[PDB]
Design a protein around this ligand. Structure first.
Ligand code: CLA
Ligand code: CLA
Ligand code: CLA
Ligand code: CLA
Ligand code: CLA
Ligand code: CLA
Ligand code: CLA
Ligand SMILES: CCCCCCCCCCCCCCCC(=O)OC[C@H](COP(=O)(O)OC[C@@H](O)CO)OC(=O)CCCCCCCCCCCCCCC
Ligand SMILES: CC1=C(/C=C/C(C)=C/C=C/C(C)=C/C=C/C=C(C)/C=C/C=C(C)/C=C/C2=C(C)CCCC2(C)C)C(C)(C)CCC1
Ligand SMILES: CC1=C(/C=C/C(C)=C/C=C/C(C)=C/C=C/C=C(C)/C=C/C=C(C)/C=C/C2=C(C)CCCC2(C)C)C(C)(C)CCC1
Ligand SMILES: CC1=C(C/C=C(\C)CCC[C@H](C)CCC[C@H](C)CCCC(C)C)C(=O)c2ccccc2C1=O
Ligand code: SF4
Ligand code: SF4
Lengths: 61, 130, 80, 739, 160, 74, 148
């Protein structure tokens, strides 16, 4: 995955679970949740972006 | 007029502390101000600061912290909050290590940190009768 | 007293600490995020349960969680 | 480049009409959830958060006032047009005591033509309870052409006010200094508006209403009555009815005002022909009011070295108990629109309630006292408007405290000292509310349980333990003795309610001494208790709007917020808005009890018919004295008994009242869904509904969200008020029109 | 007949209801004068009442013991104009409404600002879609066949 | 009749409340799942949205039309 | 009338079932609270955050469904009692005609049959039904205190 890639959220406790988002940036450092994904639908708190782990996102073909 | 010279020029309100802050605990906030600014008490109405040492007593930590948050609007930062038990048992509370909690300071250890997200919490049925 | 837990989804944006009305949360060094900081809850005895901390949390399902528990004159917000 | 106005401040364009939410910084970005739609209407008139300049807020308020006055003028024009075209006003003029006023006909669709009632005068339509016919008769309007011309003038005036609002927002908007000339504004509103309006109305009454109504009462038909302009061009048509116009204005300018006693009388009582106040008394009243208000308008210093400065008056009113006194109040009321709105709305609602009382107490229109539906509707409507306006004044006082209150500018003044001892005020008001409720209501419950136990001598009744309202009876005696003793130039008491003779017009009672017994004692103390509890809720909201022992920084959360959280044991409804919500509920309770007391007492002990020998028979038969002292009595002899007409209205011309009765019950019960439930359940149900929509690929882009907590409360209270007030509306109207 | 009911053309209580309503209307008519609009309105009411009762009598309508038309909605085509035909009419109209709404949602859902086009309707596109709903039964059973009517697993689910 | 019907409603609400309590504090997904596949009870939480949506549809259908016919008669 | 009231009963049953089933299935979590199982069966809320979380617990679903159960049982018992009052009095035509519209219920069941009850004690005397009128008023008072 990279910037601009489309991924499916696999985190169950997510307002965008099973949904598709756009990767903003994948951090190359040793952070726990490097993948930053932007969504079109705001969550219940109003935010439309979140940091996800490498195993919590699945790239769409 | 007032018991201590460092008290803010407050006329007293029926919203201050009660019998609880005489036998359980009371909170005191101290700060130094450059100007005798007029500020709003967390309990009642308007009080006047002293151009120097200021000391105020409250019944709750939240009241002292609300006053301190108001003080930040006056560019006052050196305010410090203490807890006083029924006798003179003073304990510094808010600037615990001298640095505000919003700024990272070395020497602090994480308390209540779980090395997983919310989804990793154990199922309640496995937490029965413990 | 209520229970406050911090989860590694913390991004160290400090919005929880500067929203706590009773000085329960603080920022401590960490190496799990870009900011290098994580929230901590070392003074939960002053936790009142107002949940302002998790109203300011930007992470997806929160990184600070408040579990209401036993009540105390401090946690009940009793000035009397 | 005028010194009072700014020229062409805002361009007249339709571009912002196509950008909803442009006024708000947060809503301008566009909707993302359905909460945006509701926030759009909740912030439309909150001009304080739309601009950071008091000048812009003042200009918006000024133009909004113009729009509101245009709407009011359009409404009045519609009323006059309906009177001119869809009314039996001409037939009602010739038979006021036997024709029911109707000014709205119903189209014949889906069988709804049954609503066209037999109002009399060869007319079919809905009976009108707004009293426009009596008002028009008091104005001297004897033809429907005059109603048409008044409607045309109302339309022209409405367009003029619309143009004025547009002009003063887009072409010449006044500056802040112009708005802050409270001395000049008070001078003008007191002299020009009030005094000159009273003077102009006195002139109209004297020259048009006095002769035309005197001819009408003499039996002259409206067709042979001269046109109103002929009473001005010919000093002989009015000098025959009032033989004092023959002297012209010479007695006025020679201070010989005694000559004008023909048409400027001081009689009191009611006109025996029409049952209303003597229109000569009304004209004299308006003249005196005009002179008093014009004099009162020369008080405040505006542009010369003459008059008062409100700042100097307030700052001089200090005291040992009040510290700095009224210092800073002038700055509060000249820099905060919310404080002015609070004062004006509270006094305006109180004035509306006073108007409601004085209306039925002293009927001011011809043949309006014998139109019981009109009297009941006018009283209930004005009391409801007064209660709503009072709650609004409390709400805007709380809003001022949250938003526009400056602690520094109010050091040790009255506002500061009130906040400093808010605990004492609220605790003593709590004790008073408990005392009054315990006593009034528990005396009611004691009466109920004594009656249920077969102990009739243990009640708080007249034939039992008696609580005579001696203070009110003393006042009643003082008023009935006033003519000739304390008002030596009066011929009759101000109102026959205080005592005197039974005034009947066409065998129908217009006014009659309202006896006060133990039943009135209990209901009056119920009124006092309900008013005190409403004041308690609203004052607790205003005083604790900024901080408390629970939330020391409640002002930082704003005026309108749902809570601070489940902590502190639970901090629901701590706002100040949530106090205007509970106060709205309690105002509904208080006003409902007030209007119930009025309806039952009038029907049972004032209204009715008078036999030719002088025997008085009332609508219900005097059951108020003995059966209004128990809750079972109120349930049975008032609610159950007088609800018979509403439930038996199906198939008749009053069936619409039964339908509205049922619909208002439905709406009131609907409110309880929002009042009792919470947002989380509805959000989680919307989650599954959204799942279904996504499964069918029909999920809207604007994400559907459950109504916010504050909006849920607002919807609940609005539906509750609508349902309850509509139920009482249908009940009252059907009952008082049937009988 | 069906359910013990009888045709309204032979129901005495039905004619009694008609006679009572007409008598009440005529008694109301008596208290007005000449050819005045109130009398014209009451006469129109009488005429409409008579026409409605006559039409209900000659309508294959079954009346109970109260002289009111009862609806036979078990499904039989004999009384098919009471429920079945209005049912088909409503199903057509409501399917039209739902189809045009869904088509508009899916059409503006692929533009730059989908949320803007929901508070500010694209009236040209809205008119284009709305008049295309007359084929909603055919369009629905041409999109379901192609799998374009139902989502499969991109739909979101809660934690449990 | 009134007593027994009220007791019936109370008992039904209690049954559903205790089912909810079982879900909260006694339900174990691991026991009701074998190699990824879910048993008859665990599958009720998979189409829970379908169940709730169709209950909502039936409730809205019945309420809309019963109230419509009643108000039409009114 | 039986048809319409049976459909009302079906609506009440379905709505009570909807509330209870939604609370049971959503007890372990939802989108607004994907960790609701960690807070137990009965908790006040999750705070004003995320738009507001009033009555989000499973206990609150029971609490809301109690009103609907009371309403459904009220409809059932109203139907039964009115049908049997008309059957016993003999005026079964009163139910068959007036039970098809709401005002028929309000006027001929409640308003009509409440006359003996409210006259259990009047300013003139009392009957053995006086205790029932007192209980009537007592129930109204407790109902409105619940409204409080
Ligand atoms: C603002 C107050 C007000 C209110 C509440 C009404 C209300 C009404 N007017 Mg009305 N009217 C008003 C002002 C008002 N009018 C004014 C200011 C004028 C002067 C221009 C008129 C002139 C007028 C006429 C000439 C007629 C009405 C009619 C009606 C009735 C039917 C309206 C209708 O179906 O229109 C539907 C409107 C639309 C679908 C447009 C959207 C209704 C009771 C009609 C009536 O009563 O028929 C017997 C009728 O013939 N009005
Ligand atoms: C004798 C002069 C006079 C008169 C009659 C009025 C009358 C009024 N003013 Mg006003 N005002 C005046 C002087 C005057 N003002 C001055 C000198 C100032 C500056 C301090 C203001 C500042 C002011 C503000 C800021 C506001 C008012 C408002 C109002 C209205 C109150 C609403 C009401 O009672 O409805 C009664 C309504 C009527 C009786 C309808 C007929 C009234 C018409 C419009 C005559 C208005 C007179 C007007 C001043 C003449 C100017 C004409 C123009 C070509 C120059 C009322 C129309 C309020 C309002 O509603 O805004 C529109 C409001 O917000 N006034
Ligand atoms: C002169 C009268 C007056 C004026 C100028 C204002 C002005 C204001 N009020 Mg206010 N208020 C008033 C009277 C008034 N109020 C009264 C009498 C009450 C007591 C009920 C209140 C209670 C009140 C509260 C509790 C709040 C305000 C707020 C506000 C501000 C924003 C209003 C807004 O955007 O609403 C836009 C308009 C609407 C949303 C319209 C809503 C529709 C209403 C609720 C239903 C009306 C139904 C109608 C009768 C028809 C029903 C018939 C049915 C058959 C269909 C604004 C400064 C709010 C604020 O934030 O202030 C800063 C706020 O929180 N007011
Ligand atoms: C019928 C229902 C009902 C009743 C009885 C009350 C009663 C009361 N409300 Mg209210 N309230 C109601 C509905 C009701 N409310 C609703 C629906 C709402 C929603 C908006 C509110 C919202 C509300 C607010 C927001 C406030 C109140 C307040 C009050 C209190 C006013 C003080 C008073 O009179 O106390 C006296 C008590 C009574 C009159 C109740 C009856 C007591 C009897 C007659 C006498 C004593 C009986 C005796 C002790 C029995 C002993 C025997 C027993 C042990 C077996 C009072 C307790 C105010 C408050 O806190 O008090 C100051 C207040 O601020 N209420
Ligand atoms: C117009 C598009 C549309 C479509 C195709 C559907 C389709 C559906 N809805 Mg639905 N709904 C819509 C709009 C729509 N809805 C709107 C606008 C609302 C808000 C009031 C709802 C609220 C809603 C609820 C609360 C529920 C459904 C349910 C359902 C499902 C069962 C059918 C039902 O109960 O109808 C429900 C229909 C209504 C309650 C009335 C809808 C209001 C109007 C008629 C629709 C709007 C028309 C729109 C403005 C047209 C504009 C298009 C034009 C610009 C081209 C089905 C998937 C149920 C479900 O999940 O069952 C599986 C369910 O519980 N919907
Ligand atoms: C045989 C049946 C049965 C059994 C064994 C239980 C057992 C249990 N239930 Mg349960 N429940 C039942 C039926 C049953 N319930 C029914 C029928 C309902 C629907 C109404 C419920 C609704 C329910 C809920 C919502 C909850 C429980 C809970 C519980 C658990 C704790 C109970 C507790 O703390 O009591 C506490 C007892 C009380 C608070 C006493 C309440 C007394 C009420 C108010 C009536 C008293 C007023 C009385 C009529 C006075 C008359 C007034 C006069 C003027 C006429 C326990 C395992 C709780 C739990 O945590 O489960 C794990 C829980 O949250 N149940
Ligand atoms: C007379 C009062 C009243 C009415 C009409 C409703 C109506 C409704 N409630 Mg309800 N409720 C009420 C009181 C009421 N409630 C009270 C007091 C409580 C206790 C807090 C609840 C608690 C409650 C819960 C917990 C739930 C409902 C649900 C529902 C819906 C059920 C489906 C239905 O009938 O759709 C038809 C709708 C109607 C007949 C009413 C609206 C139709 C109007 C007249 C259209 C007018 C258009 C112009 C419906 C909107 C359920 C729901 O959302 O299902 C989807 C649900 O989960 N309600
Ligand atoms: C009524 C009592 C009254 O209004 O006396 C008036 C009393 C006199 O106060 P001051 O002399 O300080 O007022 C002078 C100026 O403030 C004019 O308002 O006011 C109070 O002390 C308020 C205490 C209310 C206590 C409620 C009982
Ligand atoms: C009903 C109505 C209307 C109408 C109204 C009107 C018509 C009014 C009028 C009004 C008027 C018509 C007024 C007038 C006024 C006047 C005046 C107010 C005057 C005054 C004067 C004076 C004050 C003088 C004084 C003097 C001098 C200065 C010198 C010499 C001496 C003397 C003393 C004489 C409209 C349509 C709008 C709307 C609806 C309602
Ligand atoms: C018609 C007929 C018949 C049949 C009948 C039948 C077949 C019936 C059935 C019935 C049924 C079939 C019923 C059922 C019901 C059910 C119910 C009523 C249920 C409920 C449920 C619940 C309550 C649940 C709970 C829970 C949950 C929530 C989850 C967890 C677990 C539990 C389980 C706890 C016969 C042939 C015999 C004869 C006659 C005719
Ligand atoms: C039902 C309900 C909802 C859901 C309600 C919603 C989503 C409102 C939906 C309104 C629709 C979409 C528009 C209005 C449709 C009406 C037919 C229009 C009004 C009728 C006119 C005559 C005015 C809440 O969000 C809520 C929040 C807090 C406490 C209680 C409740 C609550 O009870
Ligand atoms: S509740 Fe949330 S906000 Fe209030 S103190 Fe405990 S943590 Fe800080
Ligand atoms: S949600 Fe309802 S309950 Fe939970 S905190 Fe906000 S207000 Fe109090």
């Amino acid at each position: 995955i990279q910037k601009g890639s489309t991924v499916r959220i696999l985190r169950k406790e997510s307002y965008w679970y099973n949904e598709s988002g756009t990767v903003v940036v994948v951090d190359q450092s040793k952070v726990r949740y490097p993948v930053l994904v932007r969504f079109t639908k705001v969550n219940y708190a109003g935010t439309n972006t979140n940091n996800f782990g490498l195993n919590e996102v699945e790239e769409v073909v | 007029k007032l018991k201590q010279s460092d008290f803010p020029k407050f006329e007293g309100s029926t919203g201050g502390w009660l019998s609880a802050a005489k036998n359980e605990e009371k909170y005191v906030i101290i700060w130094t101000s450059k100007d005798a600014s007029l500020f709003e008490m967390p309990t009642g109405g308007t009080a006047k600061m002293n151009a120097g040492n200021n000391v105020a007593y409250f019944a709750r930590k939240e009241q002292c912290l609300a006053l301190g948050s108001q003080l930040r609007g006056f560019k006052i930062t050196n305010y410090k909050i203490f807890r006083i038990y029924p006798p003179l048992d003073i304990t510094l509370l808010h600037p615990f290590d001298g640095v505000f909690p919003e700024k990272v300071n070395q020497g602090r250890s994480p308390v209540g940190k779980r090395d997983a997200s919310i989804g990793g919490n154990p199922n309640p049925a496995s937490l029965k009768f413990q | 007293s209520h229970t406050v837990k911090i989860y590694d989804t913390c991004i160290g944006c400090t919005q929880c600490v500067r929203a706590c009305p009773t000085d329960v949360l603080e920022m401590v060094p960490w190496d799990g995020c870009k900011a290098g900081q994580i929230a901590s809850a070392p003074r939960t005895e002053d936790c009142v349960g107002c949940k302002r901390c998790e109203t300011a949390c930007p992470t997806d399902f929160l990184s600070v969680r408040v579990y209401l528990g036993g009540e105390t004159t401090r946690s009940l917000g009793l000035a009397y | 480049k005028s010194t009072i106005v700014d020229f062409n401040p805002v361009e007249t364009s339709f571009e912002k009409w196509a950008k909803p939410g442009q006024f708000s910084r947060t809503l301008a970005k566009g909707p993302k959830t359905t909460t945006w739609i509701w926030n759009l209407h909740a912030d439309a008139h909150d001009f304080d958060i739309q601009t950071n300049s008091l000048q812009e807020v003042s200009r918006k308020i000024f133009s909004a006032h113009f729009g509101q006055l245009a709407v009011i003028f359009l409404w009045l024009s519609g009323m006059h047009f309906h009177g001119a075209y869809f009314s039996n006003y001409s037939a009602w003029l010739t038979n006021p005591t036997s024709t029911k006023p109707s000014a709205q006909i119903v189209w014949p669709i889906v069988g709804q033509e049954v609503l066209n009632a037999d109002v009399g005068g060869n007319f079919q339509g809905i009976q009108i309870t707004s009293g426009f016919f009596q008002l028009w008769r008091a104005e001297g309007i004897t033809s429907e052409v005059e109603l048409y011309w008044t409607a045309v003038g109302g339309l022209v005036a409405s367009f003029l006010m619309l143009f004025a609002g547009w002009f003063h927002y887009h072409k010449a908007a006044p500056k802040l200094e112009w708005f802050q000339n409270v001395e000049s504004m008070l001078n003008h509103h007191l002299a020009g508006l009030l005094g000159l309006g009273s003077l102009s109305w006195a002139g109209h009454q004297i020259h048009i209403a006095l002769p035309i109504n005197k001819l009408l009462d003499l039996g002259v038909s409206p067709e042979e009555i001269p046109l109103p302009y002929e009473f001005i061009l010919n000093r002989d048509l009015i000098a025959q009815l009032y033989p004092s116009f023959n002297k012209g204005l010479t007695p006025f300018f020679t201070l010989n005002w005694g000559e004008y006693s023909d048409f400027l009388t001081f009689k009191g009582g009611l006109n025996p022909v029409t049952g209303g106040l003597w229109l000569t008394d009304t004209a004299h009243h308006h003249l005196a009011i005009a002179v008093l208000f014009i004099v009162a308008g020369h008080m405040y210093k505006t542009n010369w070295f003459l008059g008062h400065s409100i700042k100097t008056i307030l700052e001089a009113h200090k005291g040992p108990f009040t510290g700095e006194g009224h210092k800073g109040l002038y700055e509060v009321l000249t820099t905060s629109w919310h404080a002015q709105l609070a004062i004006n709305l509270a006094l305006f609602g109180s004035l509306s309630i006073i108007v409601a009382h004085h209306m039925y107490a002293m009927p001011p229109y011809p043949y309006i006292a014998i139109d019981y539906p009109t009297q009941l509707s006018l009283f209930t409507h004005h009391v409801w408007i007064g209660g709503f306006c009072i709650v609004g004044g409390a709400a805007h006082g709380a809003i001022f405290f949250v938003r526009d209150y400056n602690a520094a500018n109010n050091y040790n003044n009255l506002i500061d000292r009130v906040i400093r001892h808010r605990d004492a005020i609220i605790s003593h008001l709590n004790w008073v509310c408990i005392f009054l409720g315990c006593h009034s209501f528990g005396l009611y419950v004691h009466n109920d349980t004594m009656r249920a136990l077969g102990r009739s001598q243990d009640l708080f009744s007249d034939n039992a333990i008696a609580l005579k309202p001696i203070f009110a009876q003393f006042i009643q005696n003082l008023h009935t003795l006033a003519p000739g003793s304390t008002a030596p130039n009066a011929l009759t008491t101000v109102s026959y309610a205080f005592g005197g003779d039974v005034i009947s017009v066409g065998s129908k009672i217009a006014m009659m001494p309202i006896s006060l017994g133990t039943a009135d004692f209990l209901v009056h103390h119920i009124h006092a208790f309900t008013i005190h509890v409403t004041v308690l809720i609203l004052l607790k909201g205003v005083l604790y709007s900024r901080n408390s022992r629970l939330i020391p920084d409640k002002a930082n959360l704003g005026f309108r917020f749902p809570c601070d959280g489940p902590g502190r044991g639970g901090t629901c409804q701590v706002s100040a808005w949530d106090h205007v919500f509970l106060g709205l509920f309690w105002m509904y309770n208080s006003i409902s009890i007030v209007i119930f007391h009025f309806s039952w007492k009038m029907q049972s002990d004032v209204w009715g018919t008078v036999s030719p020998t002088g025997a008085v028979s009332h609508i219900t038969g005097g059951n108020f004295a003995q059966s209004s002292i128990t809750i079972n009595g109120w349930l049975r002899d008032f609610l159950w008994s007088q609800a018979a007409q509403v439930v038996q209205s199906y198939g008749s011309s009053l069936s619409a009242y039964g339908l509205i009765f049922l619909g208002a019950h439905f709406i009131w019960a609907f409110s309880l869904m929002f009042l009792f439930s919470g947002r989380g359940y509805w959000q989680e149900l919307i989650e599954s509904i959204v799942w279904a929509h996504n499964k069918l690929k029909v999920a809207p882009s604007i994400q559907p969200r459950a109504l916010s907590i504050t909006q849920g409360r607002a919807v609940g209270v609005a539906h509750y008020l609508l349902g309850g007030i509509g139920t009482t509306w249908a009940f009252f109207l059907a009952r008082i029109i049937s009988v | 007949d069906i359910g013990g009911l009888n045709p309204c053309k032979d129901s005495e209580v039905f004619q009694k209801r008609l006679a009572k309503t007409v008598k009440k209307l005529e008694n109301r008519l008596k208290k007005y004068e000449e050819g005045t609009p109130p009398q014209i309105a009451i006469q129109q009411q009488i005429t409409q009442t008579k026409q409605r009762f006559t039409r209900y009598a000659d309508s294959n309508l079954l009346c109970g013991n109260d002289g009111l038309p009862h609806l036979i909605t078990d499904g039989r085509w004999s009384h098919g104009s009471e429920f079945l035909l209005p049912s088909i009419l409503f199903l057509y109209i409501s399917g039209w409404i739902g189809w045009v709404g869904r088509k508009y949602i899916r059409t503006v859902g692929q533009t730059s600002n989908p949320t803007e086009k929901e508070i500010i309707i694209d009236v040209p596109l809205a008119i284009s879609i709305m008049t295309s709903g007359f084929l909603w039964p055919f369009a629905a059973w041409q999109e379901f066949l192609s799998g374009d009517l139902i989502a499969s697993d991109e739909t979101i689910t809660t934690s449990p | 009749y009134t007593h027994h019907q009220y007791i019936a409603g109370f008992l039904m609400v209690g049954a559903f409340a205790h089912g909810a309590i079982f879900f909260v504090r006694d339900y174990d997904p691991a026991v009701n799942t074998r190699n990824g596949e879910k048993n008859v009870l665990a599958r009720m939480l998979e189409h829970k949205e379908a169940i709730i949506s169709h209950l909502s549809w039936v409730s809205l259908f019945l309420g809309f039309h019963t109230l419509g016919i009643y108000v039409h008669n009114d | 009338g039986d048809f319409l009231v049976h459909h009302a009963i079906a609506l009440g049953l379905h709505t009570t079932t909807l509330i209870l089933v939604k609370g049971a299935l959503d007890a372990r979590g939802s989108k607004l609270m994907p960790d609701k199982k960690d807070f137990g069966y009965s908790f006040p809320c999750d705070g004003p955050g995320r738009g507001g979380t009033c009555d989000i617990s499973a206990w609150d679903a029971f609490y809301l469904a109690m009103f609907w159960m009371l309403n459904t049982i009220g409809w059932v018992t109203f139907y039964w009692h009115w049908k049997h009052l008309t059957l016993w009095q003999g005026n079964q035509v009163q139910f068959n005609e007036s039970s098809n519209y709401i005002m028929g219920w309000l006027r001929d069941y409640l308003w009509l049959n409440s006359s003996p009850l409210i006259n259990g004690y009047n300013p003139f005397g009392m009957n053995s039904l006086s205790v029932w009128a007192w209980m009537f008023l007592f129930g109204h008072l407790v109902w409105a205190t619940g409204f409080m």
